[PDB]
Scaffold this active site. Structure first.
Site, PDB file in Angstrom:
ATOM      1  N   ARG B 175       0.801  -1.225   0.000  1.00 25.80           N
ATOM      2  CA  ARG B 175       0.000   0.000   0.000  1.00 25.80           C
ATOM      3  C   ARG B 175       0.836   1.277   0.000  1.00 25.80           C
ATOM      4  NH1 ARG B 175      -0.692   2.594   5.047  1.00 25.80           N
ATOM      5  NH2 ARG B 175       0.148   1.396   6.823  1.00 25.80           N
ATOM      6  N   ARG B 179       0.605   9.646   4.216  1.00 23.63           N
ATOM      7  CA  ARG B 179      -0.532  10.239   4.914  1.00 23.63           C
ATOM      8  C   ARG B 179      -0.824  11.660   4.433  1.00 23.63           C
ATOM      9  NH1 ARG B 179       1.362   8.483  11.061  1.00 23.63           N
ATOM     10  NH2 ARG B 179       1.168   6.220  10.705  1.00 23.63           N
ATOM     11  N   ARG B 256      17.589 -13.496   8.873  1.00 21.90           N
ATOM     12  CA  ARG B 256      18.372 -12.274   8.968  1.00 21.90           C
ATOM     13  C   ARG B 256      18.682 -11.987  10.433  1.00 21.90           C
ATOM     14  NH1 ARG B 256      17.180  -6.955   8.596  1.00 21.90           N
ATOM     15  NH2 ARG B 256      14.956  -7.453   8.287  1.00 21.90           N
ATOM     16  N   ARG B 287      19.352   2.644  12.235  1.00 25.53           N
ATOM     17  CA  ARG B 287      18.783   3.582  13.184  1.00 25.53           C
ATOM     18  C   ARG B 287      19.497   3.586  14.534  1.00 25.53           C
ATOM     19  NH1 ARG B 287      13.063   0.438  13.467  1.00 25.53           N
ATOM     20  NH2 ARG B 287      13.888  -1.680  13.761  1.00 25.53           N
ATOM     21  N   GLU B 312      21.927   0.107  15.376  1.00 29.98           N
ATOM     22  CA  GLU B 312      21.371  -1.140  14.877  1.00 29.98           C
ATOM     23  C   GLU B 312      21.919  -1.472  13.492  1.00 29.98           C
ATOM     24  OE1 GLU B 312      16.919  -1.566  15.135  1.00 29.98           O
ATOM     25  OE2 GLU B 312      17.230  -2.563  13.188  1.00 29.98           O
ATOM     26  N   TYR B 363       7.546 -14.172  11.523  1.00 31.61           N
ATOM     27  CA  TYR B 363       7.686 -12.998  12.371  1.00 31.61           C
ATOM     28  C   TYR B 363       6.379 -12.777  13.100  1.00 31.61           C
ATOM     29  CZ  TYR B 363       8.131  -8.349  14.271  1.00 31.61           C
ATOM     30  OH  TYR B 363       8.123  -7.254  15.126  1.00 31.61           O
ATOM     31  N   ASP B 365       4.670  -9.993  15.879  1.00 36.13           N
ATOM     32  CA  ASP B 365       4.620  -8.954  16.889  1.00 36.13           C
ATOM     33  C   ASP B 365       4.232  -9.626  18.203  1.00 36.13           C
ATOM     34  OD1 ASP B 365       5.335  -6.476  15.579  1.00 36.13           O
ATOM     35  OD2 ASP B 365       3.336  -6.423  14.652  1.00 36.13           O
TER      36      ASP B 365
HETATM   37  C1  LIG Z   1      14.414  -6.965  16.318  1.00 40.68           C
HETATM   38  C2  LIG Z   1      13.018  -7.219  16.817  1.00 40.68           C
HETATM   39  C3  LIG Z   1      12.273  -6.171  17.349  1.00 40.68           C
HETATM   40  C4  LIG Z   1      10.994  -6.386  17.850  1.00 40.68           C
HETATM   41  C5  LIG Z   1      10.463  -7.682  17.825  1.00 40.68           C
HETATM   42  C6  LIG Z   1      11.192  -8.732  17.276  1.00 40.68           C
HETATM   43  C7  LIG Z   1      12.464  -8.509  16.765  1.00 40.68           C
HETATM   44  C8  LIG Z   1      13.221  -9.646  16.132  1.00 40.68           C
HETATM   45  N1  LIG Z   1       9.213  -7.898  18.420  1.00 40.68           N
HETATM   46  C9  LIG Z   1       8.625  -9.235  18.331  1.00 40.68           C
HETATM   47  C10 LIG Z   1       8.882 -10.061  19.582  1.00 40.68           C
HETATM   48  O1  LIG Z   1      10.282 -10.234  19.785  1.00 40.68           O
HETATM   49  C11 LIG Z   1       8.213 -11.423  19.422  1.00 40.68           C
HETATM   50  O2  LIG Z   1       6.806 -11.221  19.390  1.00 40.68           O
HETATM   51  C12 LIG Z   1       8.546 -12.430  20.521  1.00 40.68           C
HETATM   52  O3  LIG Z   1       9.946 -12.705  20.485  1.00 40.68           O
HETATM   53  C13 LIG Z   1       7.792 -13.717  20.301  1.00 40.68           C
HETATM   54  O4  LIG Z   1       7.928 -14.537  21.468  1.00 40.68           O
HETATM   55  P1  LIG Z   1       8.192 -16.084  21.177  1.00 40.68           P
HETATM   56  O5  LIG Z   1       7.685 -16.862  22.320  1.00 40.68           O
HETATM   57  O6  LIG Z   1       7.519 -16.477  19.901  1.00 40.68           O
HETATM   58  O7  LIG Z   1       9.748 -16.319  20.922  1.00 40.68           O
HETATM   59  P2  LIG Z   1      11.087 -15.903  21.680  1.00 40.68           P
HETATM   60  O8  LIG Z   1      12.222 -15.962  20.732  1.00 40.68           O
HETATM   61  O9  LIG Z   1      10.942 -14.529  22.329  1.00 40.68           O
HETATM   62  O10 LIG Z   1      11.101 -17.027  22.853  1.00 40.68           O
HETATM   63  C14 LIG Z   1      11.734 -18.303  22.608  1.00 40.68           C
HETATM   64  C15 LIG Z   1      12.537 -18.689  23.825  1.00 40.68           C
HETATM   65  O11 LIG Z   1      12.886 -20.088  23.752  1.00 40.68           O
HETATM   66  C16 LIG Z   1      14.227 -20.240  24.163  1.00 40.68           C
HETATM   67  N2  LIG Z   1      14.761 -21.466  23.586  1.00 40.68           N
HETATM   68  C17 LIG Z   1      15.091 -21.684  22.274  1.00 40.68           C
HETATM   69  N3  LIG Z   1      15.535 -22.894  22.028  1.00 40.68           N
HETATM   70  C18 LIG Z   1      15.500 -23.515  23.269  1.00 40.68           C
HETATM   71  C19 LIG Z   1      15.819 -24.824  23.684  1.00 40.68           C
HETATM   72  N4  LIG Z   1      16.346 -25.754  22.881  1.00 40.68           N
HETATM   73  N5  LIG Z   1      15.605 -25.139  24.981  1.00 40.68           N
HETATM   74  C20 LIG Z   1      15.129 -24.196  25.804  1.00 40.68           C
HETATM   75  N6  LIG Z   1      14.823 -22.923  25.535  1.00 40.68           N
HETATM   76  C21 LIG Z   1      15.022 -22.644  24.239  1.00 40.68           C
HETATM   77  C22 LIG Z   1      14.922 -18.976  23.688  1.00 40.68           C
HETATM   78  O12 LIG Z   1      16.145 -18.826  24.398  1.00 40.68           O
HETATM   79  C23 LIG Z   1      13.858 -17.928  24.037  1.00 40.68           C
HETATM   80  O13 LIG Z   1      13.969 -17.479  25.385  1.00 40.68           O
HETATM   81  C24 LIG Z   1       8.363  -6.781  18.505  1.00 40.68           C
HETATM   82  N7  LIG Z   1       7.019  -7.023  18.594  1.00 40.68           N
HETATM   83  C25 LIG Z   1       6.137  -5.994  18.791  1.00 40.68           C
HETATM   84  O14 LIG Z   1       4.931  -6.194  18.926  1.00 40.68           O
HETATM   85  N8  LIG Z   1       6.684  -4.735  18.868  1.00 40.68           N
HETATM   86  C26 LIG Z   1       8.026  -4.398  18.763  1.00 40.68           C
HETATM   87  O15 LIG Z   1       8.371  -3.221  18.838  1.00 40.68           O
HETATM   88  C27 LIG Z   1       8.875  -5.507  18.566  1.00 40.68           C
HETATM   89  N9  LIG Z   1      10.236  -5.345  18.379  1.00 40.68           N
HETATM   90  C1  LIG Z   2      11.131  -3.467  15.235  1.00 41.47           C
HETATM   91  C2  LIG Z   2      10.332  -4.373  14.339  1.00 41.47           C
HETATM   92  O1  LIG Z   2       9.756  -5.373  14.771  1.00 41.47           O
HETATM   93  N1  LIG Z   2      10.264  -4.014  13.037  1.00 41.47           N
HETATM   94  C3  LIG Z   2       9.442  -4.701  12.047  1.00 41.47           C
HETATM   95  C4  LIG Z   2       8.055  -4.052  11.938  1.00 41.47           C
HETATM   96  O2  LIG Z   2       8.081  -2.639  11.614  1.00 41.47           O
HETATM   97  P1  LIG Z   2       9.229  -1.434  11.608  1.00 41.47           P
HETATM   98  O3  LIG Z   2       8.486  -0.092  11.807  1.00 41.47           O
HETATM   99  O4  LIG Z   2      10.357  -1.554  12.581  1.00 41.47           O
HETATM  100  O5  LIG Z   2       9.819  -1.393  10.127  1.00 41.47           O
HETATM  101  P2  LIG Z   2      11.255  -1.018   9.550  1.00 41.47           P
HETATM  102  O6  LIG Z   2      11.620   0.412  10.014  1.00 41.47           O
HETATM  103  O7  LIG Z   2      12.257  -2.005  10.034  1.00 41.47           O
HETATM  104  O8  LIG Z   2      10.948  -0.941   7.981  1.00 41.47           O
HETATM  105  C5  LIG Z   2      10.112  -1.808   7.181  1.00 41.47           C
HETATM  106  C6  LIG Z   2      10.369  -1.497   5.725  1.00 41.47           C
HETATM  107  O9  LIG Z   2       9.857  -0.178   5.424  1.00 41.47           O
HETATM  108  C7  LIG Z   2      10.765   0.532   4.597  1.00 41.47           C
HETATM  109  N2  LIG Z   2      11.261   1.711   5.336  1.00 41.47           N
HETATM  110  C8  LIG Z   2      11.107   1.827   6.705  1.00 41.47           C
HETATM  111  C9  LIG Z   2      11.563   2.889   7.394  1.00 41.47           C
HETATM  112  C10 LIG Z   2      12.231   3.951   6.701  1.00 41.47           C
HETATM  113  O10 LIG Z   2      12.711   4.973   7.226  1.00 41.47           O
HETATM  114  N3  LIG Z   2      12.343   3.770   5.334  1.00 41.47           N
HETATM  115  C11 LIG Z   2      11.892   2.693   4.604  1.00 41.47           C
HETATM  116  O11 LIG Z   2      12.057   2.616   3.397  1.00 41.47           O
HETATM  117  C12 LIG Z   2      11.869  -0.449   4.178  1.00 41.47           C
HETATM  118  O12 LIG Z   2      11.576  -1.034   2.913  1.00 41.47           O
HETATM  119  C13 LIG Z   2      11.845  -1.469   5.321  1.00 41.47           C
HETATM  120  O13 LIG Z   2      12.320  -2.753   4.921  1.00 41.47           O
HETATM  121  O14 LIG Z   2       7.262  -4.669  10.934  1.00 41.47           O
HETATM  122  C14 LIG Z   2       7.857  -4.548   9.631  1.00 41.47           C
HETATM  123  C15 LIG Z   2       6.852  -5.036   8.610  1.00 41.47           C
HETATM  124  O15 LIG Z   2       5.872  -4.042   8.321  1.00 41.47           O
HETATM  125  C16 LIG Z   2       9.179  -5.310   9.624  1.00 41.47           C
HETATM  126  O16 LIG Z   2       8.926  -6.682   9.926  1.00 41.47           O
HETATM  127  C17 LIG Z   2      10.106  -4.685  10.665  1.00 41.47           C
HETATM  128  O17 LIG Z   2      11.378  -5.332  10.676  1.00 41.47           O
END
Ligand SMILES: Cc1cc2c(cc1C)N(C[C@H](O)[C@H](O)[C@H](O)COP(=O)(O)OP(=O)(O)OC[C@H]1O[C@@H](n3cnc4c(N)ncnc43)[C@H](O)[C@@H]1O)c1[nH]c(=O)[nH]c(=O)c1N2
Ligand SMILES: CC(=O)N[C@H]1[C@@H](OP(=O)(O)OP(=O)(O)OC[C@H]2O[C@@H](n3ccc(=O)[nH]c3=O)[C@H](O)[C@@H]2O)O[C@H](CO)[C@H](O)[C@@H]1O
Ligand SMILES: Cc1cc2c(cc1C)N(C[C@H](O)[C@H](O)[C@H](O)COP(=O)(O)OP(=O)(O)OC[C@H]1O[C@@H](n3cnc4c(N)ncnc43)[C@H](O)[C@@H]1O)c1[nH]c(=O)[nH]c(=O)c1N2
Ligand SMILES: CC(=O)N[C@H]1[C@@H](OP(=O)(O)OP(=O)(O)OC[C@H]2O[C@@H](n3ccc(=O)[nH]c3=O)[C@H](O)[C@@H]2O)O[C@H](CO)[C@H](O)[C@@H]1O
Ligand code: NA
Ligand code: NA
Lengths: 386, 386
Positions: B175, B179, B256, B287, B312, B363, B365
């Site tokens: 999309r 805004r 990744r 960022r 990051e 992935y 949230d």
């Molecule tokens: C970089 C980034 C940033 C964000 C987010 C993700 C990422 C990657 N999240 C998403 C959030 O991290 C996600 O929703 C949770 O990690 C999901 O929880 P899980 O239980 O699925 O897995 P998660 O990975 O958290 O839990 C799995 C656990 O199992 C353990 N484990 C693995 N293998 C094992 C084994 N063999 N034995 C025992 N323990 C083991 C791991 O060590 C870990 O503690 C997010 N969401 C959102 O809503 N807003 C946000 O702003 C963000 N920001």
């Molecule tokens: C912290 C976290 O969980 N981040 C995830 C969340 O939103 P995020 O808001 O963190 O998204 P992000 O900033 O990581 O960007 C998502 C995508 O938007 C584009 N972009 C974003 C920002 C900017 O300044 N310019 C630009 O071009 C770019 O193509 C990028 O790949 O959900 C996204 C999907 O919608 C991705 O899964 C992000 O990794």
């Protein structure tokens, strides 16, 4: 009796006194209001064409850090999560507002770190030092410097007060109007929102009590002798104009007024933000309110193609012109002082208390007025009704 | 028995399954976690020098429009009124973000009314039409045009994926990212905030139940034979990596990863905003997070002169590198498909359920994971425990 208390005026002050007396002391309360509606200047109604809520006595944004007031008003209404933000129009560009890293970037050309901006302001503003400033133009420049003062304050202030800023008390700026971050919440208070079903609905809920009677379209001075006759030492809370009560026998208190030009445009969205300040002199108005943005949570009950806007103009209040803001020339505060002992007399003379913005000649935010009312209730009225 | 359910992993998914089983079915739950702490990737802790809360698996902002999830999580913690906002750095200027009247003004030189900006975008973007776009660069330009695409998307995207955007599926933009107003709330969801006492405190409260036992520093694969021995048809919820469970017998799933460079600077404030995106290629990182701004309500327990920031970086995950985001090359989704029938087998084979981001290669949230867990609880586990 048919009533135990008379309240002149149905603004927030009167209403709060009323409600407290009715619900807490169980007294019968007669409210007398001159206008056709409840609410005083906080009153809102729907523009007829669009159905969008507008405030006809100026835009009203509710905000407080007083928990007592906040808990109180939520008795009568829920609030939205609305957070007020303002943008400032200058030379064809909408600037982030108030003054902070946001505005600084747009205006000076590049990004300044918080420390970088403090330093920027230190230089810009070191021309005049704040203790050697005589009028408003000086005091401002002494705090933020000329480029900013001239772009965002000079014409805006002059419009609002109909006066050259060099001709204004230096006392009117008291702190640094600059933020060294990107935070552009307009208000710094703990609690903030808009009444969910609008102000009218809220105000009405306050008066909706089995002990409160309301007579709209009723001037107090036309019916005082009659009503006091019916119960002669029921006390009166008067929230009408203070000088008018005493027949201007000490002169006419000086107010600033506002003129509101309200158009319905054939667009869904005219500026894409609640309030746009206009800071350049080439525009008569100080700002434009686009009311649909005050309540985005309603957008599916809002016309998809029309929007009601409203331009705000400022000048000095003549006869019949609504009083909005007190002016407070020293040749104003002296005739006040005399009226306050007139009133204090009248309070021990005839059990008539004076409150609220008109009856004390004082600007009050809504939470301030409500606090003021609650104070007067607890400290003056509880005794006056036993 | 000593337990009725085993949960591998203590992230939000595992935790939610656990808590539901303990509180709703009254079952004994053993949670097995590999790391030293509870929480999975949502875990936060205090940086030692400053005491400021940081998230070591990436910044976590909580937001949902799912009332069920929201009511649930408030059982375990209160949230702040924090609203997420982002600024975007490009050519020495912090731009309002995401793309809206705010950014448009700063970048194109003057203010565009909402209608004016729709028109602006119509022209800018009419070069390519969205149905005749082949890769990512095209699809973007087809939606917002080159000037914007090249300034705010090109390098940023390329940094995040280590790839030229011309070499990316056109399917990744769905999309209009624009805004036509000044509203710069980052998220469009009903409910939003940060856990008041931080994530760790929240996550811990979930596991704090008289029926839940937690063994930190415990790999499941090292103790599975032993524990299943103790109660052989206690079921298992596995939330660890899906491919690792089946000993990569169908190949290695492609993730990744993220690298976090975390400095303590000797300033009270480094950018005056939680998150600053960096969109130009001349910076290695995507960022910078400055964590004190995530919790301004604590500023009087924050060092007045130091601040913890964190840069990051993004690249492809090798061995031991933490998995963060699934890649989903088609040569990835095929070995998934095979693992899901391996798992489905294993579920009817040995009462082992697979959930959460690692165990489903998806992935999520936080609210999504919690919803996913609550779904699996109600639809799979309630039957599996009677
Ligand atoms: C970089 C980034 C940033 C964000 C987010 C993700 C990422 C990657 N999240 C998403 C959030 O991290 C996600 O929703 C949770 O990690 C999901 O929880 P899980 O239980 O699925 O897995 P998660 O990975 O958290 O839990 C799995 C656990 O199992 C353990 N484990 C693995 N293998 C094992 C084994 N063999 N034995 C025992 N323990 C083991 C791991 O060590 C870990 O503690 C997010 N969401 C959102 O809503 N807003 C946000 O702003 C963000 N920001
Ligand atoms: C912290 C976290 O969980 N981040 C995830 C969340 O939103 P995020 O808001 O963190 O998204 P992000 O900033 O990581 O960007 C998502 C995508 O938007 C584009 N972009 C974003 C920002 C900017 O300044 N310019 C630009 O071009 C770019 O193509 C990028 O790949 O959900 C996204 C999907 O919608 C991705 O899964 C992000 O990794
Ligand atoms: C332009 C502008 C904009 C704002 C605000 C004010 C102004 C001037 N307010 C402040 C708000 O308007 C103020 O707090 C209330 O008006 C105070 O209520 P009162 O009861 O004091 O007087 P108010 O004037 O509201 O009530 C007095 C009532 O008495 C009636 N009356 C007068 N004489 C009478 C007589 N002889 N007989 C009978 N009835 C009579 C009047 O008709 C009126 O209904 C505000 N505050 C805030 O917190 N946030 C905001 O955003 C704003 N916005
Ligand atoms: C709607 C309402 O009730 N407004 C009142 C409220 O705040 P407001 O936020 O409405 O204040 P305002 O915008 O009317 O401005 C207050 C003063 O700040 C200066 N200024 C403001 C905006 C701008 O773009 N440029 C500029 O220079 C100017 O000197 C002006 O006189 O409280 C103020 C006192 O703090 C005044 O009593 C305002 O009338
Ligand atoms: Na100075
Ligand atoms: Na197009």
């Amino acid at each position: 009796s048919d009533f135990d208390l008379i309240v002149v005026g149905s603004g927030l002050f009167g209403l709060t006194v009323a409600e407290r007396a009715a619900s807490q002391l169980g007294k019968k309360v007669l409210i007398v209001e001159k206008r056709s509606h409840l609410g005083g200047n906080a009153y809102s109604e729907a523009e007829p064409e669009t159905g969008i809520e507008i405030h006809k006595y100026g835009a009203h944004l509710f905000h407080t850090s007083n928990k007592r007031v906040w808990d109180y008003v939520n008795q009568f209404t829920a609030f939205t999560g609305y957070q007020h933000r303002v943008f400032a129009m200058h030379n064809g560009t909408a600037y982030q507002f108030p003054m902070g890293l946001g505005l600084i970037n747009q205006f000076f050309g590049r990004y300044y770190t918080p420390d970088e901006a403090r330093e920027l302001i230190k230089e810009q503003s070191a021309e005049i030092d704040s203790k050697d400033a005589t009028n408003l133009e000086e005091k401002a420049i002494s705090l933020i410097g000329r480029p900013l003062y001239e772009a965002f304050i000079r014409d805006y202030t002059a419009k609002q007060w109909q006066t050259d800023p060099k001709e204004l008390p230096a006392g009117n700026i008291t702190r640094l109007p600059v933020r060294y971050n990107f935070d552009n919440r307009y208000f710094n208070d703990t609690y903030e929102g808009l009444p969910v079903d609008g102000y009218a609905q809220w105000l009405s809920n306050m008066a909706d009590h089995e002990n409160i009677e309301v007579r709209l379209d009723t001037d107090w001075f036309e019916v005082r002798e009659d009503l006091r006759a019916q119960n002669p030492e029921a006390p009166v809370v008067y929230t009408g104009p203070l000088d008018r009560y005493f027949d201007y026998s000490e002169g006419h208190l000086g107010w600033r007024t506002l003129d509101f030009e309200t158009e319905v445009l054939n667009t869904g969205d005219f500026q894409g933000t609640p309030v746009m300040n206009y800071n350049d002199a080439e525009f008569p108005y100080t700002r434009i309110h686009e009311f649909r943005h005050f309540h985005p949570e309603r957008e599916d009950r809002h016309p998809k193609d029309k929007t009601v806007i409203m331009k705000e103009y400022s000048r000095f209040a003549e006869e019949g012109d609504e009083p909005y803001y007190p002016i407070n020339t020293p040749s104003d505060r002296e005739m006040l002082f005399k009226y306050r002992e007139l009133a204090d007399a009248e309070t021990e003379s005839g059990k008539v208390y004076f409150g609220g913005r008109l009856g004390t000649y004082q600007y009050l935010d809504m939470h301030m007025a409500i606090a003021s009312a609650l104070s007067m209730f607890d400290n003056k009225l509880v005794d006056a009704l036993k």
